[PDB]
Design a protein around this nucleic acid. Structure first.
Ligand SMILES: [Zn+2]
Lengths: 88, 252, 171
DNA sequence: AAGAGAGTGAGGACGAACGCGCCCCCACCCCCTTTTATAGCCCCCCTTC
DNA sequence: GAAGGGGGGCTATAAAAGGGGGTGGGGGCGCGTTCGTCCTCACTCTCTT
């Protein structure tokens, strides 16, 4: 009864169904994305790119372009170089 | 190369490991033949990726108790496909699982795509996608599976006697020969044939039981069984002992 | 949110306004209406008036109002040549090609028009640095001579040996 | 003819170097969607008893 | 509640579009050990006294 034939594993279809339902992240307008980024900047001084993506919920490439337009990354000697939301 | 005999086939000698003129006796080469060896008497990404893929292949094989020869054949297929690099985009696990499927087919002991999927994290859909790509890349082919290619594994996994397996093999082959199930998958026919033979013997297996081992939904078994049920007396082997008479086989 | 999510839209909205070609200055209150920030805090109005709208290098105070600073940004071919000349004359340094493209729309026409007058230095990240082409003293030789110049290794010799050759040949 | 300081042998704590990772960013590909005929397989839901 | 049937979905097949997301291959630097340099001290001579 072990390794019985199966078209797809239950864990795989459930994950696939969840991704399909959630769908891919869309490209929001720059103004709305900028407003969300600046609003969240008050909560903390610095954000990680991966963590910032979850908050903004925008494509990584699109988010990076917006962040590059204003934001910059500072080299930190404690963990690694991370993005700083302050343009200056 | 006897100086007296240009173009002479020197005879290898194992006494000292030298080649002697076939008709002079002159020893050309003192002890150059190396008799003992001849006659039986910091890892690269490509290498590391192959290493992990080989580990996955062996891990998959042990799950379904495959012999090492199939694993070796699978490893050779992966090297060809991996080095050819037509499937670089595809995940190595999918390539390995498809290679394992091909290796089983090439050795005459096919495992159904569901059987290979059950031992791999890759879905059956993706294995089929990589299966077709591998054949194109390697310019190879696999002989079409038959109903009898699964009778031994299925019947053995169902704890069915040898006579039931023999009858099941005969029924499935005869049904295909009579074209009673045109277009049906061989696995579906094999499961239905097993069900008919099983129901006609002391060891009776339900539709659900055969589906689980065969990987075929009981509905699919029901459809194929319904097609062959009318010709039940003809499909059964002539020298078969019916615990349950053919006329009293389940109807559904 | 508060004190940070309101000032940005003022700058962003102002940048878009200039692209329409409206060089006319705008008041603090006037910009707030179009930025949907009419409810901005009272102490933010003075903070923007006193610090944000004067310290920023893109805000020009005109007749008491505020207007964009296209003069500082390069928007003409002649300005591009002049800016590089000042950098070389004052030794300020080069400018990345990206900083000019944003400031100068269709910068390719100006960059190609000046031709060799601009020295392009490609960074490892493909970023190009522009430097003024000082045409005062120029000198070049064939690649054969340059390759031969490299073939004459000099870092592999000590001071004593290097100076010895002078008296060896009689110079 | 006798004091502090020192040579020598000798033991003990600390900084730069060496690894030795764990995390990250940039190509590359795949996937998403839409249409259509085809047939088998399979799953969810409804219905009969 | 068990079982059969109806309706609906998945799959391959081509082809194009544009772009998000996953993944593999390199690059980057922080933190647990290791050895030589630095520093401290017990037992005898020496310049100054
Ligand atoms: Zn001879």
């Amino acid at each position: 009864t072990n390794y019985k034939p199966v078209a797809n594993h239950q864990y795989n279809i459930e994950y696939e169904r969840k991704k399909k339902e959630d769908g891919k992240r869309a490209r929001a307008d720059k103004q709305h994305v900028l407003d969300m980024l600046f609003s969240a900047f008050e909560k903390h001084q610095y954000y990680n790119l991966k963590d910032l993506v979850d908050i903004t919920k925008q494509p990584v490439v699109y988010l990076k372009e917006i962040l590059k337009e204003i934001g910059v990354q500072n080299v930190k000697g404690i963990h690694k170089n991370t993005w700083e939301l302050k343009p200056e | 190369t006897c100086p007296n005999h240009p173009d002479a086939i020197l005879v290898e000698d194992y006494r000292a490991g030298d080649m002697i003129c076939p008709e002079c006796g002159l020893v050309v080469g003192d002890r150059v033949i190396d008799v003992g060896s001849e006659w039986r008497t910091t890892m690269s990404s490509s290498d590391r990726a192959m290493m992990n893929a080989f580990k996955e292949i062996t891990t998959m094989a042990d799950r379904i108790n495959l012999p090492r020869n199939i694993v070796d054949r699978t490893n050779n297929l992966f090297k060809q496909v991996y080095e050819q690099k037509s499937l670089k985009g595809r995940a190595n696990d999918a390539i390995a699982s498809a290679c394992l499927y091909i290796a089983c087919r090439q050795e005459g002991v096919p495992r159904t795509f569901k059987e290979i999927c059950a031992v791999s994290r890759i879905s059956k859909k993706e294995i089929g996608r990589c299966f077709k790509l591998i054949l194109k890349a390697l310019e190879t082919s696999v002989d079409l599976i038959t109903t009898g290619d699964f009778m031994s594994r299925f019947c053995s996994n169902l704890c069915l006697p040898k006579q039931v397996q023999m009858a099941a093999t005969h029924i499935a082959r005869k049904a295909v020969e009579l074209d009673l199930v045109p277009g049906r998958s061989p696995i579906s026919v094999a499961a239905a044939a097993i069900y008919m033979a099983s129901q006609a013997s002391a060891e009776k297996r339900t539709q659900k039981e055969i589906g689980d081992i065969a990987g075929v939904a009981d509905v699919t078994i029901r459809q194929s069984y319904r097609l062959i049920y009318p010709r039940a007396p003809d499909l059964f082997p002539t020298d078969f002992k019916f615990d349950t008479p053919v006329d009293k086989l389940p109807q559904l | 949110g508060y004190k940070f999510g309101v000032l940005a839209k003022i700058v962003n909205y102002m940048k878009t306004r200039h692209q329409r070609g409206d060089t006319h200055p705008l008041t603090l209150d006037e910009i707030l209406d179009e930025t949907q920030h009419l409810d901005i805090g009272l102490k933010q109005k003075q903070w923007l008036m006193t610090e944000a709208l004067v310290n920023n290098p893109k805000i020009e105070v005109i007749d008491g109002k505020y207007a964009f600073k296209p003069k500082y940004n390069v928007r003409d071919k002649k300005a591009l040549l002049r800016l590089l000349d000042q950098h070389d004359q004052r030794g300020l340094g080069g400018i990345l090609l990206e900083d000019i493209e944003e400031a100068l729309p269709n910068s390719q026409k100006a960059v190609k028009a000046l031709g060799d007058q601009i020295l392009f230095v490609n960074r490892p990240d493909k970023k190009k640095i522009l430097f003024f082409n000082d045409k005062s003293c120029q000198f070049s030789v064939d690649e054969e001579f340059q390759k031969l110049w490299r073939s004459v290794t000099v870092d592999s010799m000590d001071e004593e040996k290097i100076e010895e050759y002078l008296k060896r040949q009689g110079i």
